[PDB]
Request: fold
Amino acid sequence: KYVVHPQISALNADRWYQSFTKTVFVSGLPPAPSLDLAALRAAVCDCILQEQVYVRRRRPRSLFDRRQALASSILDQVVRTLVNLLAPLNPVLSTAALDCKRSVDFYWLRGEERIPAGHRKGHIDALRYQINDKPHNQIRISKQLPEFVPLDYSIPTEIPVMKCKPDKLPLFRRQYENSIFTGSKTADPCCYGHTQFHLIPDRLKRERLIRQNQAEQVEAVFRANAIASLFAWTGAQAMYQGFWSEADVTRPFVSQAVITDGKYFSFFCYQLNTLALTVQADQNNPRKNLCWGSQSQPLYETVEDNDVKGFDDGTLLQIVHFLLNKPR
Amino acid sequence: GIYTSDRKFVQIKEMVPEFVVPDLTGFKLKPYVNYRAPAGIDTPLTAKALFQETVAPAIEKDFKEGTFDANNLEKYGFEPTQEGKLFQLYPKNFPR
Amino acid sequence: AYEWGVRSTRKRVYEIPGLEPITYEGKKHFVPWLARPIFPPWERGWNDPRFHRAAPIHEQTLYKEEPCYIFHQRCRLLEGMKQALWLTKTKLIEGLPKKVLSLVDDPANHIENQEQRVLDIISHARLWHSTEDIPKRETYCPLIVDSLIQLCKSQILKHPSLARRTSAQNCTLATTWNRESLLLQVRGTSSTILSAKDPLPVIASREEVEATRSHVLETFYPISPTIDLQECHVYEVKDDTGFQEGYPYPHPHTLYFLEKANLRPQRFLPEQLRAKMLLFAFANALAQARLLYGNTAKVLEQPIVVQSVGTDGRVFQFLVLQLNTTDLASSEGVKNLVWTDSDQLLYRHFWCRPVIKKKVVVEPVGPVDFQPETFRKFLALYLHGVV
Amino acid sequence: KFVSWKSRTKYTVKPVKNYRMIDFLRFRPEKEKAPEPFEEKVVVVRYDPCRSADIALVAGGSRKRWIIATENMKAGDTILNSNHIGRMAVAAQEGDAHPLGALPVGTLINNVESEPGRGAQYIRAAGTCGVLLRKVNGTAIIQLPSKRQMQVLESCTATVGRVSNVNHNQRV
Amino acid sequence: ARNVLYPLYQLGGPQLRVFRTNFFIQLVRPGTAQPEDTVQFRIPMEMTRVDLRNYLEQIYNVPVAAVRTRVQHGSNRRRDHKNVRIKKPDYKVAYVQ
Amino acid sequence: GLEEFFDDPKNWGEEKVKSGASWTCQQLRNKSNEDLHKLWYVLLKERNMLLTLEQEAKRQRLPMPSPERLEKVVDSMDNVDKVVQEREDALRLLQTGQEKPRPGAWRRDIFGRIVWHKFKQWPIPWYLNKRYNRRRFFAMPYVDRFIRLRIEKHARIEARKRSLQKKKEKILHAKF
RNA sequence: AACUGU
RNA sequence: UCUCCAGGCAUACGCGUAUAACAACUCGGAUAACCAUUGUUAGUUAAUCAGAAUAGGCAAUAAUCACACUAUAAAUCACCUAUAACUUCUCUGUUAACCCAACACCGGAAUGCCUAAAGGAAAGAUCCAAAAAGAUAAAAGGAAAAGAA
RNA sequence: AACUAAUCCUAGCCCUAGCCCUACAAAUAUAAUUAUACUAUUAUAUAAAUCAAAACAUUUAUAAAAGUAUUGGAGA
Reply:
């Protein structure tokens, strides 16, 4: 089966993933307790200064992971403090489960092909795929999030269709275990989740992509990772609820995801309407999966001395909105 | 490039050739020549011919003027060593 | 047979005056019919790190004749507790501080369904967290501590004052001090150094601090105090609190040290862990004192209190250290006060899979002989200084 | 010219990738001790893959080192090592390393050396014991496992007792 | 440039510049199905994909997004009248987006 | 540009494309050093297009129009290189006197033959290069017998050559 | 010994 | 479409174009059909799959869900202290019904998954000879069931 | 006048004479033919026996004087 990388540099990678998943990605955010928003900036300002300028740690030997390591530390701290500061306002977070770099697995079949040669020449074989993703952080709750749009919602925007085979684009089929995983076992009470946090590597970062001339694909890299992770993660929960392709979900599965390149931050929302992507189960289904994503935005400008400059609350507001949101 | 420890490739920018492309705009020399064009009698350039064309006039003028000496042979174009030039005639250190 | 010399190694013409023998140097290669040339040292024209060799310690410019003994995580003291007390000039009181014990006596401190939540966390930390049937200590031991800290951190609802502290990530603690003219250095890392804007309350009164003068550090003839320490002749004098100057929370509340080695031979003994904690905890407190009071040697008027917790995921060790003196040159006088609670078992055993014996499920997927008291002692340390 | 598999820089008592580095020179004066009677603790009696007899881990003072185990050597035992040649015999316990001048006649010994400073080369196998046949002043007679009775100077070091697997010769 | 000697590099050495290029490449219609932006090239086996990227960008001023290259084994089954195996010249196929 | 890899759209489908004579050596010599470098790429660009067109013809199982065009370009390209090499050779000889761009010398192999050994640049010297010393540039004593055989083999070849001539002479008499 | 198309 | 059969799929090793399309119907398949033969052209796409700095100091305690519990058969670089370097994605492998057995051999061939959703056809035609081989059935009998010596 | 077949003349060789001789690129001794460091680097004994002595043992060749004297299990 094909091995799919949630973060990839392929052209139109978001389109390729959507075609396999039947996900429609509408630009922008999905249609829809005060905590001293200024206080978070000051607390976040300290957190950024804490790791960058105050904490003392052994320098990495590689000298190339230093930039990547620093971005992870600041993101983890902000998340840790944000959970504590938001805990009094939202008791749900106290009962919520936060996952640190745990893997999401999903396995599904889309498309078909006929064997052209070999002992099985002429036999029709379905295209097998797998996405394994390890979001930087993700929040898992025991209650489904409020739906962002009614089930069966139809919009003019259409799912992509891929001219070439998945093999033609770099994607290699390998035989190994098929896994569908929510980030935790079925035993874990938190079979739902609120938001997913992703950190893009340096190779896929904006600076390198612009140099590579794939500036337009920077959002595609953002889109591809979000769609892959959320669909793979969301589908697992519905499987944890007993729903599969022929037993498609009776209630849409909804959640959020945020992808940051270290400086810019992007916010993504996914709703899973169809578990049926096999030809048999998809033979009779008018539903489609809907994804809503926002463009990546900087969270702060620069770090000078012991005071960070240019912090953008607008990105922080979205995090505050996401953290405060709770099931209805 | 060079492969470091753990078999990890590290591209060496110096060892990666840079294609120096001539400016062909306005250049009258093309893939072919007319059958109209007569061929020239071959006169390959040699060390003696190059010396005669370039070095001989300078020495001849200086010798008549008397301002010739062994110390100033490099002035007429002698290179004691090829080191320091991007293109070294011997040992050859440049790609075509 | 004993071999003197490594067992691995075991199973005229030129002198003539007036002429020089010919050699194959002109050939540029060896030929049997020519003599071996004499080759001077080769000059590459540039310095290669791959072929560069670090000079011996004595040749270093930073070389110092006096030996500086450096203690790190892997260092294991032969005498364990006794050596640590002598090196740190501290007096030991068994059990946790009286205040810490009183913290959890308050019903509000106790977490809602504390035992059940801990039981669920232990099961999650051991089995549910990963897809592996039997996760190893290298994985679950870091996770269980993080989950317990989050469970304790969730108490911010009950006590908003807990927002005044934050936890770093494996900060570096280091100090250099002299004991009976012996140069001692402690180098520490790991932990999340939980730091608060205010120092932890002093556990012992000044009268008790003066009482420590009677206490005498135990000696262990014939072994030297510097045993098991890395003898260093090239070193720099440094004092490190784990944070650069200007850190909003200058006072460290607790210093955590974890041993996640799956194999018992790979796991340090509980006595050694506490000895490592003592030196590392002492260094962090000393760095604070030196920064506050300078490098002068004197009895501290205001003691500095720091805590340390050491656990391997099944056994938990709780350590509280109070720094009462900076005059550590002498072995007699005011001594630091340390409170120790050791061998606190969260659970005797955990089965990562359901144990079916004689077609009967004798053991569920959960801790065996679980002791909630250990978490309460852990909870007491975390809440101490706030409630 | 063959790359040695014993590539560890420093002598250690931990198993080495396992192989344990053994020391057959029993009396090496450890740090913080004079060349006089000093005592060591037999921490653990393990088995050496590269030697027939099982090795006893001897730890004394500031130094830890592996050694061959005698017949009755076990974990937790205290073993004495003395270089001093007293006018009267020094107290002898099974496995302790003393000069043959210290040892009394008739004691079973092992890990003996033919020449002073040679190091242990005989009675290092399982169940082998050398009898101190005779002792006079600075000379002693040791019956080696080769059946060769040899006379050596008192400077030679002898470890009392038979080697482990005492009934190896009695195997049927 | 192929069938030529390139200078050995040492630390601080000059940047490698090829003023005249002996590499000759052929654009070939895709035998397999490929995206339209993708272009196949038959190139000397000693050329690197970076060289092709530099080659197209500099000589032909062509912007390149991605490059994928494969080596096609030349059949040696064919034999001559003397029963001596004939080997098809191996060629490298480069997929350039 | 991509279009440069292909022929003129008008020329597509033509039996042949009108092209002139290839560059001669003397004309290239008359051209300047900078001009020669510029010309090589201009010559190369057509060659790649012709090679590009030829491969498509092979794919389509079709003939290449005006195949002489490729030969003419190669002749022009080859003539350029010798002219450039001649100028480099002349200057190299003057400044250094070396008849070869690369250092080399005559060395004896283990078979007793004398062959030109081109020296290789190494980061380390030969004496500290054990592998280079490991390389054998010396002939073994037993090669003397082979040397005698080589001389005998050469004599045998001449004897066989005379036999070859004799048989040819016979037929000359028979034919005439 | 029985058993059975031995 | 029907009748019937039930080890299938990956990697390793090996092979090296036997791969696929087209065109041939002579040779090769241990006979044809059909191609595995003959000729022509195509093919196997990788930052992710696979292949391709140094000197010192210093390490007691198996595993077995490792805890209890014992045991004998005895089973574990790191990290510190300094020195040195200072911004990287190329090259190569990737096809196939394939290999070792003189063969399209009958057997030999490492590992993981799984047992039909995967993989397959015993019938060149006609006749219904005898004899021969294998299998099934036995009126009555039971060596002309599995127990004893 | 038949099918299978057959037909042919040079490919070249052989012996003396004469004559001695002194005439692409790229990769390679590492694992030869592997574009740059590793690891130091290397042939050759009386010629024997077979054989003859009908076996086998000392022994057994390889211009005239003259196959003579001498030598030899005085025998080949």
Remarks:
- The two ends of chain A are 40 Å apart (CA to CA).
- Helices of chain A lie at 13-21, 37-54, 65-86, 91-95, 206-211, 217-240, 279-282, 313-324.
